[PDB]
Amino acid sequence: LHMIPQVAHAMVRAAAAGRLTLYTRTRTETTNFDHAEYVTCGRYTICAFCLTTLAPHANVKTIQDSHACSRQPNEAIRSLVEVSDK
Amino acid sequence: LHMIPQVAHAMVRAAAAGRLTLYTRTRTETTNFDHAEYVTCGRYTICAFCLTTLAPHANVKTIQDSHACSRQPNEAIRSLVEVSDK
Amino acid sequence: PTGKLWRPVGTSVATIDSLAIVSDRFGQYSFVNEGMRETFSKALFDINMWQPLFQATKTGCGPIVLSSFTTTTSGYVGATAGDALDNPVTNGVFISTVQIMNLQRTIAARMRDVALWQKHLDTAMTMLTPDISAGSASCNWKSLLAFAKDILPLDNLCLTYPNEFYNVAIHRYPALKPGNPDTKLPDAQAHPLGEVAGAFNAATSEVGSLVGSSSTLSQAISTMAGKDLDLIEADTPLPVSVFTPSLAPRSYRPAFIKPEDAKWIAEFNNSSLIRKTLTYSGATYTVQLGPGPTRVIDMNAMIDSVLTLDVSGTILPYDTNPDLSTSVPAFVLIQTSVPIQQVTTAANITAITVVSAAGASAINLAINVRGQPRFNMLHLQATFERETITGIPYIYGLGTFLIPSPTSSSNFSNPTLMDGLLTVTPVLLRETTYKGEVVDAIVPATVMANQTSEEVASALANDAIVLVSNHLNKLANVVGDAIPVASRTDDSATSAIVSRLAVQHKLSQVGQASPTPPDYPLLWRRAKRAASMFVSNPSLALQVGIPVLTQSGMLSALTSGVGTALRTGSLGKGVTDASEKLRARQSLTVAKQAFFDQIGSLWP
Amino acid sequence: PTGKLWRPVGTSVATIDSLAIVSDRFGQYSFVNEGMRETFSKALFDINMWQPLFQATKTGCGPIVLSSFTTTTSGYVGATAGDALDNPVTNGVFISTVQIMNLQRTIAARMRDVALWQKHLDTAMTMLTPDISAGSASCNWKSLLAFAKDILPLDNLCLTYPNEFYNVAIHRYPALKPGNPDTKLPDAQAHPLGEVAGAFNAATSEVGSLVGSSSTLSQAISTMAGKDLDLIEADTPLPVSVFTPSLAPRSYRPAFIKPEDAKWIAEFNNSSLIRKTLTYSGATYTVQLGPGPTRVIDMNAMIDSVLTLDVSGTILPYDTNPDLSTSVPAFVLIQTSVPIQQVTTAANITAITVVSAAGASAINLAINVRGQPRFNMLHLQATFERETITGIPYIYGLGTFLIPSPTSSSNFSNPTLMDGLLTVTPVLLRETTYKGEVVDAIVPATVMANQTSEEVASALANDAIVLVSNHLNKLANVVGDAIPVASRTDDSATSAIVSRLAVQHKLSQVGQASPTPPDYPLLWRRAKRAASMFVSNPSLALQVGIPVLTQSGMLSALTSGVGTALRTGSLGKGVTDASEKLRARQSLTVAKQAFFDQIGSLWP
Amino acid sequence: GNVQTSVNTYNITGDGNSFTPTSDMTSTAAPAIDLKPGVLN
Amino acid sequence: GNVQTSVNTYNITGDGNSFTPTSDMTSTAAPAIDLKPGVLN
């Protein structure tokens, strides 16, 4: 089973005080969501394409994954971070 | 099973406003509880000795029973009637 | 022996493997055991009878001998090589498959042929009751004939072949005795082909009728073993299946049923009103829970059924409180936080779902029937499901009103449409309900004398009570039917009970002066009305406070008596009141003789 | 044949009924099949060995020949007339009951006799390690003897009979080779009575030790079939019994466990405080539910256990808020109307029962340990029972404080004594718990990669998780033990997994450019650490987010591999690292030879 | 449907089997065996 | 305990039976039969 809603409760609390760092496929952080795949807190890591938990810990430089797709609303948590980043 | 507590809810509502009365073993009504056995509302009838339901009809003149025993507090419903009889 | 015939395929030595169903170009020869020839002979016999009508009408094809479909093979005949080895039959009589086909389609084709004629013969035969059941009674033949020459409608077949049907008839009605050719007089005895059968059906004056009294017994015996009347008050878990509950959808009238009289229905007994709101189809309505207690169907303790609350003919006072009109009546669930019967005000009611509203307000659903506008018969209806209410500790089904705007006028109204005739239909038999809980097994003995007067009539369609009532009801018709629990004959039923009362009243006398030697004439009579009161209203045995009937012994006792009682009736059980029964039959034959007397005069 | 011998009681013709256990004045002759003589001979053989010590000490009574307890009867020998008929044995060797008694009490009496001496021989034998496992190593006999002449304590029995024990010894230690009488020199070969057995235990340098490697396998095979490691990740309901949960009482530290990390523990997350009251033993106390969320043990989803909340060493700040002192700490149930996590204020809490208070206030239970007064180790403790909470939708166990008078001081305290080490012990194994519900069967595969890091460590003693952990743990010791999942030997375990990764990564490559031909050197190595990470911490396979291990294939796969892997180990499985293992044994014999060299000098 | 071979004279997946109801032979074993007291004896 | 008679050589309620454990014969059937691969063959 995908997510395990204790994970999603850590998504919103990291996005209601936006610490969420969106990482691309080349393991670099961006803030645009278009090139980004990995989503951190930094407790949990989720690739935005397949939308599954990947590592309990953060620092996505040490994660192995094989998925490939496109756009994935919810952008709403991504939108909630930049509002709460102020 | 004895009484069926729908019966006891009819005891107290007949004792909140005292209607009940106390019938003796010779099928005459008294108000002393010492010579009395049968207890009415007048929906349900209960002999005070064995304390079981006997006939939902009253007129305890038409009830057959065979029990014989003494000492039966609750006298409290008997006491609540004469206070509420005023 | 029985089954298909086999033969040693490996030859000579027939072992449990050197056999093989002797099949071939005709199919497989199946053995025709003694009794199975009785049937096909009894079937063909009933067709040959119509011989005179087959020739007359050039149909048929000669008499059908069963010896034309069989053969005289020989080998081992069983159901399987293994067991067929123990039935060496020599020159037995087997019928091959392709033959088992003709003896079939022949008896079928001929059966049509006769079934038709046989119908004409009848509209004419029974058209003068050739059957009396006490003494005799004639009717001078001339008249009789010259009479039916009339009545019989022009399209019978008894007018086209009189003594071509008559010859068939003479063999079916030992009433018509043909006049012997060489003495030109009747015969006293009547010789119809059904010689024996017809002899053993006559209502023998000694005992009603063997064919009757015999069946009324085997019939009861069937039930007794079948449904499982035995074990009727067994004290231990029993799968609802053991009660074969079917075609079981009982209907009520809640908003009247007291909450304690039937666990599946709690009420909002609160001081003031509890007006809540809910956006249903855009429009915002207000559920009321008005002045009175508003009894609502509880959802837990409600076996996933098909609740269909009908609201018709019931008053609809939109005339006075205009508040009522405009509100679409609708069955709605109500999830409350705090348990009902503890739910005080609106903030307490979690949510409210309109599980089924009625399109069009309360002023189109009306219909004036003398001032008091009634409800045009309409059925609102949910489909409650055990688990759609999982977790949810408190939730209630309520067929209320949904007022579009609460007012002062509806301050003493209380829009519960529950006064209507609700009809719950358990849609999932496996699960029953008892005392408010859903179960998979009942404990019979528990449900005896455990309900109150109305804790029975208020039972919920397919709940222990309704099951431990459907059961007694069968056992009630076995006694009512077979056993004579309705005469001063201290029958096996009222007798099983008497022995319990004795053994019971006898030990209650043990210890203490024993000043009262058991009665018996009074015990027999007390148990007679006990067994009788049961046959009468099977239900009672569930209500607390019923003399005798509700003591643990009885019933468990009764049935096991009635049980062995049926398994011994003899055949002449009909000897009971076979005197007045006889005298009544003579009474009829005297009046029927009176009829034949007119047929005899009018049509001379 | 086997069993007692029977004989034709009806004489001559022996049918399946003309037989009868041939009993008599001696009891019943039971047949002594070939192998059962191996035991009683092997037992007596080990006693005869001590012959030289039996005569020396005038005990015993001559050598015990097994041919003194048997006989040479003949008849049919089976377990029952029916089957004994198919075992006609002539002049077989049977032992009568009364004999089966002596061969028993003799081997028992003698067994004591020797068991004693045999103990003295030992404290002297092993008292100079007569066993090396690589190459040889002597120790000039004179010294050796003249040495033990010392060490051996004055109450042995090897000093009272030197060459009466020596002769017994020579047959047990192929180390002591007696000097031949007519050439006055050793023998090279050593001939101890255990000639073969002792040959097959030597640590053979080719492969560790046959006796070892053989058992370590049959041992693992036992478990594999026993507990039911097979079927370890079966996807379908399994009775808890199938998991033989025993000696299983896990302890925690709630008031810390997040509610979502373990369903059996909800919290009162409410704004302000919720001071309630309750007359306990006359005195009126106030349960607090202070400032923080106060996580409480939920009662539903709590398998009728034996909750024993220990409160010791934990802080007890009666020093600051004096309010805390005077209050007897006590585990108390709390029935709330509205569901917790929705229970706002006091009027919401139905009732509160002190299921177990601690006599004496919080100022006698204390004990100063450097300012911060702690709690004198004491155990409060309820005995929750599934049904004592029937109906009651909401109820929670809370080990709080029961303040005799709430004050401003205790306005930020929150007296939950749950910070203590609570120890629940399921007292009714049949029922397990999963995701908050009580069940009777688990679905293994469901519990894999379904818990979180701590949704495992927070498991409730005897709940699916704790059961699907106790299970993997066995299977984890079978691999850890038998299979070599701890060397670069790509063993059967890490091999079963590799085949899954391939078949898996291979189809995920099907459809689309297939630009990546499967790796394999990388797959072998990835699955090696997967099988290895499992043996390591069996638990992990339950946590969501573990590489390989948590895909449905593995485990179900692993086990069934490890399975067949054990059923083929051969005997010489010990060949693994049997090189360094060997070189290490020679290392020891070189150091032990060094010892004998001193025994050889010091005591010349 | 895995091949058996002798246990029973017919394979299920055997060659040329054929499900095909005929209004003519209504499939039926033996349920109504009479055992009632009078009728069994 | 109703009398049987021949089914089995002993009646339970039979004459002079006797429950009486003896430390000498510890009651035991055959549970530990060895079947493991190497040991069964």
Ligand SMILES: *C(=O)CCCCCCCCCCCCC
């Ligand atoms: C092998 O067993 C494959 C499954 C084919 C038959 C299984 C049972 C379904 C067909 C029934 C045949 C016998 C009477 C229904």
Ligand SMILES: *C(=O)CCCCCCCCCCCCC
């Ligand atoms: C008749 O069946 C009366 C009951 C007496 C025996 C029933 C079973 C209890 C005794 C067991 C005997 C066999 C081994 C325990």
